Amino acid sequence: ADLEDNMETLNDNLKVIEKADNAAQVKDALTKMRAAALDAQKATPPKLEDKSPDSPEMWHFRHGFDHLVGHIDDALKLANEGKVKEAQAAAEQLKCHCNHCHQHYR
């Protein structure tokens, strides 16, 4: 899957958590988002075509996925503790990670 693929996965599943018909769908969507974020971290965004892999732009790009994954894991723990409403509430705050990285590089 490519960067555009990974972003569709993240967008589709973030909305699944918002609209989840049952609590089990939240964990399933978080799982898919974690995979998509780790895959996206290995891509080069088009607006950073010309920059070094050691550039601060690419550093901040990759770091954003690390941090996103951290907070997805926080949400998964809540869901794995059966605290599925708390997990759904946490998942809505993930939108800040999307918005922040997009500000820079989308």
Q: Which parts are annotated binding residues for heme b?
A: 7
98 in Cβ contact with 17 (< 8 Å)? no
Residue 82 region, left (φ>0) first, then alpha (ψ -120 to 50), else beta?
A: left
| Candidate segments 24-32, 50-58, 75-83, 96-104, binder of ligand HEC by CB under 6 A | 96-104
Q: Which does 61 bind (CB under 5 to 8 A by kind): its own copies, ligand HEC, none?
A: ligand HEC
CB-based contacts of 17: which residues, under 8 Å, 6+ apart? 25, 26, 29, 30, 88, 91, 92
Q: Which does 105 bind (CB under 5 to 8 A by kind): its own copies, ligand HEC, none?
A: ligand HEC
Query: Which residues contact ligand HEC by CB under 6 A?
Result: 3-4, 7, 10-11, 14, 45-46, 61, 64-65, 68, 94, 97-98, 101-102, 105-106
